[PDB]
Ligand binder design. Sequence first.
Ligand SMILES: *[B]([O])([O])[C]([C])[N]C(=O)[C]([C][C][C][C][N]C(=O)O[C]C1=[C][C]=[C][C]=[C]1)[N]C(=O)[C][C][C]([N]C(=O)OC([C])([C])[C])C([O])=O
Length: 354
Amino acid sequence: NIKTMIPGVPQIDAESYILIDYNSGKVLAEQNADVRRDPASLTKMMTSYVIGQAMKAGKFKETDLVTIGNDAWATGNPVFKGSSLMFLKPGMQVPVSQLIRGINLQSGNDACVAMADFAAGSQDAFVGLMNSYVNALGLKNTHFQTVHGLDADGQYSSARDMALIGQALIRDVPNEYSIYKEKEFTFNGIRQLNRNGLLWDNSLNVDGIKTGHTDKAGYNLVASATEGQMRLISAVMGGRTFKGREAESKKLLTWGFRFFETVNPLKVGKEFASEPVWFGDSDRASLGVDKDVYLTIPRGRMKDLKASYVLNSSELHAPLQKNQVVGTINFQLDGKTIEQRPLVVLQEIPEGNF
Ligand SMILES: *[B]([O])([O])[C]([C])[N]C(=O)[C]([C][C][C][C][N]C(=O)O[C]C1=[C][C]=[C][C]=[C]1)[N]C(=O)[C][C][C]([N]C(=O)OC([C])([C])[C])C([O])=O
Protein backbone atom coordinates (compact mmCIF):
# COMPACT_ATOMS: atom_id res chain seq x y z
CA ASN A 1 0.00 0.00 0.00
CA ILE A 2 2.88 2.36 0.80
CA LYS A 3 4.75 1.27 -2.35
CA THR A 4 1.69 1.65 -4.60
CA MET A 5 0.26 4.85 -3.06
CA ILE A 6 -1.09 7.54 -5.40
CA PRO A 7 -0.42 10.90 -3.71
CA GLY A 8 -3.27 13.39 -3.31
CA VAL A 9 -2.78 16.63 -5.24
CA PRO A 10 -2.83 19.93 -3.30
CA GLN A 11 -5.66 22.40 -3.90
CA ILE A 12 -4.44 25.18 -6.19
CA ASP A 13 -6.17 28.58 -6.07
CA ALA A 14 -6.12 29.16 -9.84
CA GLU A 15 -8.20 28.58 -12.97
CA SER A 16 -5.71 26.15 -14.48
CA TYR A 17 -2.38 24.51 -13.85
CA ILE A 18 -0.03 21.82 -14.93
CA LEU A 19 3.10 20.33 -13.44
CA ILE A 20 5.48 18.45 -15.73
CA ASP A 21 8.92 16.85 -15.64
CA TYR A 22 11.29 18.73 -17.97
CA ASN A 23 13.27 15.66 -19.00
CA SER A 24 10.59 12.96 -19.33
CA GLY A 25 7.64 15.21 -20.28
CA LYS A 26 5.58 13.34 -17.69
CA VAL A 27 2.50 15.26 -16.47
CA LEU A 28 2.45 14.92 -12.67
CA ALA A 29 -0.72 16.88 -12.01
CA GLU A 30 -3.10 18.97 -14.07
CA GLN A 31 -6.40 20.87 -13.90
CA ASN A 32 -7.98 22.54 -16.93
CA ALA A 33 -4.56 22.39 -18.57
CA ASP A 34 -5.93 22.78 -22.13
CA VAL A 35 -8.41 25.58 -21.40
CA ARG A 36 -7.67 28.64 -23.54
CA ARG A 37 -6.90 31.69 -21.44
CA ASP A 38 -5.34 35.13 -21.72
CA PRO A 39 -1.55 34.63 -21.48
CA ALA A 40 -0.48 38.15 -20.36
CA SER A 41 3.37 38.40 -20.10
CA LEU A 42 3.75 34.67 -20.49
CA THR A 43 3.64 35.69 -24.17
CA LYS A 44 7.15 37.04 -23.59
CA MET A 45 8.52 33.49 -23.18
CA MET A 46 7.74 33.05 -26.86
CA THR A 47 9.20 36.44 -27.73
CA SER A 48 12.32 35.40 -25.82
CA TYR A 49 12.29 31.96 -27.54
CA VAL A 50 12.29 33.60 -30.99
CA ILE A 51 15.09 35.97 -29.98
CA GLY A 52 17.04 33.03 -28.51
CA GLN A 53 16.68 31.07 -31.76
CA ALA A 54 17.87 34.08 -33.77
CA MET A 55 20.91 34.40 -31.51
CA LYS A 56 21.67 30.65 -31.62
CA ALA A 57 21.62 30.96 -35.41
CA GLY A 58 24.05 33.91 -35.16
CA LYS A 59 21.76 36.56 -36.64
CA PHE A 60 22.89 38.99 -33.96
CA LYS A 61 24.86 39.00 -30.75
CA GLU A 62 24.44 40.37 -27.23
CA THR A 63 26.82 43.31 -27.86
CA ASP A 64 25.04 44.53 -31.04
CA LEU A 65 23.40 47.96 -30.63
CA VAL A 66 19.72 48.32 -31.43
CA THR A 67 18.55 51.77 -32.48
CA ILE A 68 15.19 52.47 -30.87
CA GLY A 69 12.35 53.46 -33.26
CA ASN A 70 9.11 55.37 -32.69
CA ASP A 71 7.02 52.22 -32.10
CA ALA A 72 9.14 51.28 -29.05
CA TRP A 73 8.96 54.78 -27.56
CA ALA A 74 7.38 54.02 -24.19
CA THR A 75 5.73 57.41 -23.72
CA GLY A 76 4.96 57.91 -27.42
CA ASN A 77 2.37 55.12 -27.62
CA PRO A 78 -0.59 55.10 -25.13
CA VAL A 79 -1.00 51.34 -25.73
CA PHE A 80 1.82 51.11 -23.16
CA LYS A 81 -0.23 52.89 -20.45
CA GLY A 82 0.19 51.05 -17.15
CA SER A 83 2.48 48.42 -18.59
CA SER A 84 5.93 47.26 -17.54
CA LEU A 85 8.42 49.49 -19.47
CA MET A 86 12.16 50.28 -19.91
CA PHE A 87 11.11 53.79 -21.00
CA LEU A 88 13.00 53.51 -24.25
CA LYS A 89 13.08 56.63 -26.39
CA PRO A 90 13.65 56.98 -30.15
CA GLY A 91 17.31 57.33 -31.05
CA MET A 92 18.64 55.43 -28.05
CA GLN A 93 21.23 52.80 -29.01
CA VAL A 94 20.83 49.92 -26.61
CA PRO A 95 22.82 46.64 -26.60
CA VAL A 96 20.78 43.48 -27.31
CA SER A 97 22.01 42.23 -23.90
CA GLN A 98 20.19 45.06 -22.18
CA LEU A 99 16.99 44.73 -24.16
CA ILE A 100 16.71 40.98 -23.60
CA ARG A 101 17.13 41.52 -19.86
CA GLY A 102 14.45 44.24 -20.13
CA ILE A 103 12.22 41.52 -21.62
CA ASN A 104 13.26 38.60 -19.42
CA LEU A 105 13.81 40.21 -16.04
CA GLN A 106 11.46 43.19 -16.25
CA SER A 107 8.84 42.17 -18.87
CA GLY A 108 9.45 45.49 -20.68
CA ASN A 109 6.77 45.84 -23.37
CA ASP A 110 8.71 48.51 -25.19
CA ALA A 111 11.84 46.29 -25.25
CA CYS A 112 9.68 43.59 -26.91
CA VAL A 113 8.80 45.96 -29.76
CA ALA A 114 12.41 47.10 -30.15
CA MET A 115 13.67 43.52 -30.39
CA ALA A 116 10.84 42.44 -32.69
CA ASP A 117 11.66 45.13 -35.23
CA PHE A 118 15.38 44.38 -34.86
CA ALA A 119 15.01 40.62 -35.28
CA ALA A 120 12.20 40.45 -37.81
CA GLY A 121 11.59 43.87 -39.45
CA SER A 122 8.09 44.47 -38.06
CA GLN A 123 5.95 43.38 -35.15
CA ASP A 124 3.66 41.52 -37.61
CA ALA A 125 6.58 39.52 -39.07
CA PHE A 126 7.84 38.74 -35.55
CA VAL A 127 4.38 37.54 -34.51
CA GLY A 128 4.46 35.25 -37.58
CA LEU A 129 7.68 33.72 -36.25
CA MET A 130 6.04 33.26 -32.84
CA ASN A 131 3.14 31.43 -34.40
CA SER A 132 5.49 29.41 -36.62
CA TYR A 133 7.15 28.02 -33.48
CA VAL A 134 3.70 27.40 -31.98
CA ASN A 135 3.24 25.07 -34.94
CA ALA A 136 6.75 23.57 -34.75
CA LEU A 137 6.22 22.77 -31.06
CA GLY A 138 2.88 21.05 -31.74
CA LEU A 139 0.92 23.38 -29.44
CA LYS A 140 -2.84 22.89 -29.80
CA ASN A 141 -4.24 25.80 -27.81
CA THR A 142 -1.99 28.79 -28.44
CA HIS A 143 -2.12 31.78 -30.75
CA PHE A 144 -0.31 35.09 -30.55
CA GLN A 145 -1.29 38.42 -32.01
CA THR A 146 1.32 40.76 -30.51
CA VAL A 147 4.96 40.66 -29.34
CA HIS A 148 4.31 41.49 -25.67
CA GLY A 149 1.20 39.72 -24.41
CA LEU A 150 -0.83 42.74 -23.52
CA ASP A 151 -4.41 41.44 -23.63
CA ALA A 152 -5.32 40.95 -27.29
CA ASP A 153 -8.73 39.94 -28.57
CA GLY A 154 -7.66 36.83 -30.48
CA GLN A 155 -4.62 35.77 -28.49
CA TYR A 156 -4.63 32.76 -26.14
CA SER A 157 -2.63 29.96 -24.61
CA SER A 158 -3.09 27.30 -21.92
CA ALA A 159 -1.29 25.92 -18.91
CA ARG A 160 -0.02 22.88 -20.86
CA ASP A 161 1.12 25.00 -23.79
CA MET A 162 2.95 27.52 -21.60
CA ALA A 163 4.67 24.70 -19.73
CA LEU A 164 5.77 23.29 -23.11
CA ILE A 165 7.04 26.70 -24.22
CA GLY A 166 9.07 26.78 -20.96
CA GLN A 167 10.41 23.34 -21.68
CA ALA A 168 11.32 24.49 -25.19
CA LEU A 169 13.21 27.55 -23.89
CA ILE A 170 15.25 25.45 -21.51
CA ARG A 171 15.95 22.75 -24.07
CA ASP A 172 16.50 24.63 -27.35
CA VAL A 173 17.92 28.00 -26.32
CA PRO A 174 19.81 27.38 -23.07
CA ASN A 175 21.92 30.54 -23.45
CA GLU A 176 18.69 32.55 -23.50
CA TYR A 177 17.26 30.56 -20.62
CA SER A 178 20.34 31.15 -18.42
CA ILE A 179 19.34 34.85 -18.28
CA TYR A 180 16.15 34.18 -16.37
CA LYS A 181 17.80 33.45 -12.99
CA GLU A 182 19.62 36.82 -12.98
CA LYS A 183 18.23 38.73 -10.04
CA GLU A 184 18.79 42.24 -11.39
CA PHE A 185 20.24 44.32 -14.21
CA THR A 186 20.87 48.07 -14.61
CA PHE A 187 19.60 50.32 -17.43
CA ASN A 188 20.00 54.11 -17.63
CA GLY A 189 21.47 54.29 -14.13
CA ILE A 190 18.50 52.46 -12.60
CA ARG A 191 18.69 48.98 -11.10
CA GLN A 192 15.84 46.71 -12.13
CA LEU A 193 14.86 43.62 -10.18
CA ASN A 194 13.80 40.36 -11.81
CA ARG A 195 10.05 40.19 -11.23
CA ASN A 196 10.17 36.45 -10.52
CA GLY A 197 10.03 36.53 -6.68
CA LEU A 198 10.60 32.76 -6.34
CA LEU A 199 14.26 33.28 -7.34
CA TRP A 200 14.77 34.46 -3.75
CA ASP A 201 13.04 31.45 -2.14
CA ASN A 202 15.83 29.59 -0.26
CA SER A 203 13.72 26.40 0.00
CA LEU A 204 13.76 25.72 -3.77
CA ASN A 205 16.22 26.13 -6.61
CA VAL A 206 13.95 28.15 -8.91
CA ASP A 207 15.74 29.56 -11.97
CA GLY A 208 12.79 30.66 -14.14
CA ILE A 209 10.70 31.51 -15.92
CA LYS A 210 7.97 34.18 -16.22
CA THR A 211 5.51 35.83 -13.92
CA GLY A 212 2.83 38.10 -15.33
CA HIS A 213 -0.48 39.76 -14.67
CA THR A 214 -3.01 41.55 -16.85
CA ASP A 215 -6.58 42.40 -15.92
CA LYS A 216 -8.05 39.57 -18.03
CA ALA A 217 -5.37 37.00 -17.21
CA GLY A 218 -5.28 37.30 -13.40
CA TYR A 219 -1.97 36.10 -11.94
CA ASN A 220 0.06 33.84 -14.19
CA LEU A 221 3.34 32.10 -13.51
CA VAL A 222 5.51 29.60 -15.31
CA ALA A 223 8.18 28.41 -12.91
CA SER A 224 10.97 25.89 -13.21
CA ALA A 225 13.07 24.44 -10.42
CA THR A 226 15.60 21.70 -9.83
CA GLU A 227 16.56 19.19 -7.14
CA GLY A 228 19.38 16.75 -7.95
CA GLN A 229 18.70 14.86 -11.23
CA MET A 230 15.39 16.58 -11.50
CA ARG A 231 13.81 19.59 -13.11
CA LEU A 232 10.12 20.41 -12.88
CA ILE A 233 8.11 23.03 -14.74
CA SER A 234 4.84 24.45 -13.35
CA ALA A 235 2.35 26.64 -15.16
CA VAL A 236 -0.39 28.25 -13.16
CA MET A 237 -2.78 30.49 -14.96
CA GLY A 238 -5.56 32.70 -13.68
CA GLY A 239 -4.21 32.70 -10.12
CA ARG A 240 -6.99 34.27 -8.07
CA THR A 241 -5.10 36.27 -5.41
CA PHE A 242 -2.10 38.53 -5.04
CA LYS A 243 -0.98 36.54 -1.97
CA GLY A 244 -1.01 33.25 -3.91
CA ARG A 245 0.96 34.55 -6.92
CA GLU A 246 4.11 32.59 -5.92
CA ALA A 247 2.78 30.35 -3.14
CA GLU A 248 0.41 28.26 -5.30
CA SER A 249 3.23 27.36 -7.70
CA LYS A 250 5.49 26.66 -4.74
CA LYS A 251 2.87 24.16 -3.50
CA LEU A 252 2.99 22.28 -6.82
CA LEU A 253 6.75 22.25 -7.20
CA THR A 254 7.33 21.18 -3.59
CA TRP A 255 4.72 18.40 -3.94
CA GLY A 256 6.37 17.27 -7.21
CA PHE A 257 9.83 16.79 -5.72
CA ARG A 258 8.49 15.11 -2.59
CA PHE A 259 6.48 12.42 -4.41
CA PHE A 260 8.31 11.85 -7.69
CA GLU A 261 11.76 11.29 -9.13
CA THR A 262 13.40 11.23 -12.56
CA VAL A 263 15.49 8.25 -13.64
CA ASN A 264 17.71 8.01 -16.73
CA PRO A 265 17.99 4.25 -17.27
CA LEU A 266 19.43 4.41 -20.80
CA LYS A 267 21.46 6.80 -22.96
CA VAL A 268 21.69 7.14 -26.77
CA GLY A 269 24.25 4.82 -28.30
CA LYS A 270 24.53 2.40 -25.36
CA GLU A 271 23.56 -1.24 -25.86
CA PHE A 272 20.31 -2.32 -24.20
CA ALA A 273 20.04 -5.61 -26.07
CA SER A 274 21.64 -7.76 -28.77
CA GLU A 275 19.99 -9.99 -31.36
CA PRO A 276 21.30 -12.20 -34.15
CA VAL A 277 21.22 -10.79 -37.68
CA TRP A 278 21.05 -12.57 -41.03
CA PHE A 279 22.86 -11.63 -44.24
CA GLY A 280 25.03 -9.03 -42.42
CA ASP A 281 28.73 -8.14 -42.19
CA SER A 282 28.23 -8.83 -38.44
CA ASP A 283 26.36 -11.74 -36.87
CA ARG A 284 24.75 -9.57 -34.14
CA ALA A 285 22.84 -6.30 -33.96
CA SER A 286 23.45 -3.95 -31.05
CA LEU A 287 20.15 -2.42 -29.97
CA GLY A 288 19.21 0.62 -27.86
CA VAL A 289 17.63 4.06 -28.28
CA ASP A 290 18.13 7.16 -30.45
CA LYS A 291 17.17 9.54 -27.62
CA ASP A 292 18.08 9.49 -23.93
CA VAL A 293 15.38 7.76 -21.86
CA TYR A 294 14.02 9.75 -18.93
CA LEU A 295 11.18 8.37 -16.81
CA THR A 296 9.30 9.97 -13.94
CA ILE A 297 8.29 7.49 -11.25
CA PRO A 298 7.13 7.64 -7.63
CA ARG A 299 10.05 8.71 -5.40
CA GLY A 300 12.03 5.74 -4.06
CA ARG A 301 10.79 3.17 -6.61
CA MET A 302 14.00 3.32 -8.71
CA LYS A 303 15.16 -0.07 -7.37
CA ASP A 304 11.86 -1.64 -8.48
CA LEU A 305 12.11 -0.52 -12.12
CA LYS A 306 12.37 -3.40 -14.57
CA ALA A 307 13.00 -3.31 -18.28
CA SER A 308 12.39 -5.76 -21.10
CA TYR A 309 11.70 -5.65 -24.83
CA VAL A 310 9.71 -7.01 -27.73
CA LEU A 311 10.68 -7.29 -31.38
CA ASN A 312 8.58 -6.29 -34.38
CA SER A 313 9.79 -9.09 -36.63
CA SER A 314 10.69 -12.74 -36.06
CA GLU A 315 14.15 -12.26 -37.61
CA LEU A 316 16.51 -9.40 -38.25
CA HIS A 317 17.78 -9.23 -41.82
CA ALA A 318 20.63 -7.03 -43.08
CA PRO A 319 20.99 -4.30 -44.25
CA LEU A 320 20.13 -2.67 -40.93
CA GLN A 321 20.31 1.13 -40.90
CA LYS A 322 21.49 3.17 -37.91
CA ASN A 323 18.49 4.07 -35.75
CA GLN A 324 16.23 1.64 -37.61
CA VAL A 325 13.26 0.78 -35.37
CA VAL A 326 13.14 -2.95 -34.61
CA GLY A 327 11.11 -3.21 -31.41
CA THR A 328 9.94 -1.56 -28.23
CA ILE A 329 11.43 -1.28 -24.74
CA ASN A 330 8.95 -1.73 -21.91
CA PHE A 331 9.77 -0.19 -18.54
CA GLN A 332 7.79 -1.79 -15.68
CA LEU A 333 6.86 -1.22 -12.05
CA ASP A 334 4.94 -3.84 -10.04
CA GLY A 335 4.48 -6.00 -13.17
CA LYS A 336 2.78 -3.31 -15.27
CA THR A 337 4.40 -1.48 -18.20
CA ILE A 338 4.50 2.22 -17.24
CA GLU A 339 6.62 3.51 -20.17
CA GLN A 340 7.57 2.37 -23.73
CA ARG A 341 10.42 3.60 -25.94
CA PRO A 342 11.45 2.61 -29.47
CA LEU A 343 14.19 -0.06 -29.76
CA VAL A 344 16.59 0.88 -32.54
CA VAL A 345 19.77 -0.42 -34.25
CA LEU A 346 22.79 1.39 -32.75
CA GLN A 347 25.48 0.62 -35.39
CA GLU A 348 24.62 0.04 -39.06
CA ILE A 349 24.84 -3.53 -40.39
CA PRO A 350 25.13 -3.56 -44.16
CA GLU A 351 24.81 -6.78 -46.19
CA GLY A 352 27.91 -8.97 -45.88
CA ASN A 353 30.71 -8.50 -48.39
CA PHE A 354 33.35 -11.20 -48.73
B1 LIG B 1 3.16 41.15 -18.33
O1 LIG B 1 2.09 40.24 -17.73
O2 LIG B 1 4.02 41.73 -17.19
C1 LIG B 1 2.51 42.33 -19.20
C2 LIG B 1 1.78 41.78 -20.42
N1 LIG B 1 1.56 43.07 -18.37
C3 LIG B 1 1.64 44.40 -18.27
O3 LIG B 1 2.53 45.04 -18.83
C4 LIG B 1 0.65 45.11 -17.39
C5 LIG B 1 -0.15 46.14 -18.18
C6 LIG B 1 -1.51 45.67 -18.66
C7 LIG B 1 -2.27 46.89 -19.21
C8 LIG B 1 -3.46 47.28 -18.33
N2 LIG B 1 -3.20 48.60 -17.77
C9 LIG B 1 -3.65 49.80 -18.15
O4 LIG B 1 -3.33 50.82 -17.55
O5 LIG B 1 -4.53 49.95 -19.30
C10 LIG B 1 -4.00 49.95 -20.63
C11 LIG B 1 -4.69 50.97 -21.51
C12 LIG B 1 -6.03 51.30 -21.31
C13 LIG B 1 -6.66 52.24 -22.13
C14 LIG B 1 -5.94 52.86 -23.16
C15 LIG B 1 -4.60 52.53 -23.37
C16 LIG B 1 -3.98 51.58 -22.54
N3 LIG B 1 1.44 45.91 -16.45
C17 LIG B 1 1.83 45.43 -15.27
O6 LIG B 1 1.55 44.31 -14.88
C18 LIG B 1 2.69 46.33 -14.40
C19 LIG B 1 2.04 47.66 -14.01
C20 LIG B 1 3.03 48.84 -14.01
N4 LIG B 1 4.31 48.32 -13.53
C21 LIG B 1 5.43 49.04 -13.42
O7 LIG B 1 6.46 48.51 -13.00
O8 LIG B 1 5.45 50.46 -13.76
C22 LIG B 1 6.53 51.17 -14.39
C23 LIG B 1 6.03 52.56 -14.77
C24 LIG B 1 7.72 51.30 -13.45
C25 LIG B 1 6.97 50.44 -15.66
C26 LIG B 1 2.50 50.00 -13.16
O9 LIG B 1 2.22 49.80 -11.95
O10 LIG B 1 2.37 51.12 -13.70
